[PDB]
């Protein structure tokens, strides 16, 4: 695949993965955050900890990673190992075990317009305050708080990922015929909300 190699060498000539892709010095990188729940592994009331297996769904644009497909043999998209592009440092803020990053850095998909999409898998153990009062007939309200650890709201702007129709489907996506159904817990509501700041950073919960 010679033309793909030549395009890939062109894109990363002088590319710095530690630098966010603001074009002007004041520009903000808008990052859409979505979540796909693969398996609710467990909820532990003694440790006030919920374990989930999820796929993140992060999408942004990097102007440095754009090209004309007609000049590069019609290559309309490129798959690139995530360690070699700039990635937003979106982490689980309310994790309980001290693990912030995703479980596996899979390759990102880069569109010819510079749109980057990343869907890394994750094993997460978010803390969750247990409503003990009605146990074991209780219902629980557990939050996963995703935000950029370092970048301010003036550098990275988080947004809830839209639905396939482009509607504001602010929900945890569940593959209805693929989700591994938990035997003890029934999922009732699964919304998401962008939280505005009161060093200010946004959160997607």
């Amino acid at each position: 695949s010679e033309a793909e190699g030549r395009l890939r060498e062109k894109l990363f000539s002088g590319y710095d993965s530690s630098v966010r892709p603001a074009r002007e010095v004041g520009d903000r990188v808008r990052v859409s955050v979505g979540l796909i729940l693969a398996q609710l592994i467990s909820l532990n009331e003694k440790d006030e900890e919920m374990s989930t297996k999820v796929y993140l769904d992060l999408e942004w644009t990097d102007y440095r990673l754009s090209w004309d497909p007609a000049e590069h043999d019609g290559i309309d998209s490129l798959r690139i190992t995530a360690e070699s592009v700039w990635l937003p440092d979106v982490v689980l803020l309310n994790n309980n075990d001290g693990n912030f990053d995703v479980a596996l850095d899979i390759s990102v998909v880069v569109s010819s317009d510079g749109s980057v999409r990343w869907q890394p898998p994750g094993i997460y153990r978010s803390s969750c305050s247990i409503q003990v009062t009605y146990f074991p007939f209780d219902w629980q309200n557990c939050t996963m708080v995703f935000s950029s650890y370092s970048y301010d709201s003036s550098e990275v702007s988080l947004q809830t990922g839209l639905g396939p129709d482009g509607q504001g489907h602010q929900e945890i996506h569940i593959h209805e015929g693929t989700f591994i159904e938990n035997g003890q817990w029934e999922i009732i509501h699964k919304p998401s909300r962008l939280i505005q700041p009161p060093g200010q950073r946004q959160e997607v919960i």
Binding site: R79, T81, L104, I106, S107, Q119, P121
Partner: protein
């Protein structure tokens, strides 16, 4: 594969051959001699599907 999708990689079951005829290996391979059977579970079926 998470790094490559069905457009990039095509998964298929291993083909073997016997009597010059090929066949797909549609089952989990187990050693009939060296597989130490588990203490509590007997494997009744072991299919494979793409």
């Amino acid at each position: 594969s998470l790094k490559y999708t069905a457009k990039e990689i095509t998964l298929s079951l291993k083909q073997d051959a016997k009597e010059n005829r090929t066949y797909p290996v549609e089952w989990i391979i187990i050693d009939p001699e060296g597989f130490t059977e588990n203490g509590e579970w007997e494997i009744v079926h072991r299919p494979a599907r793409v």
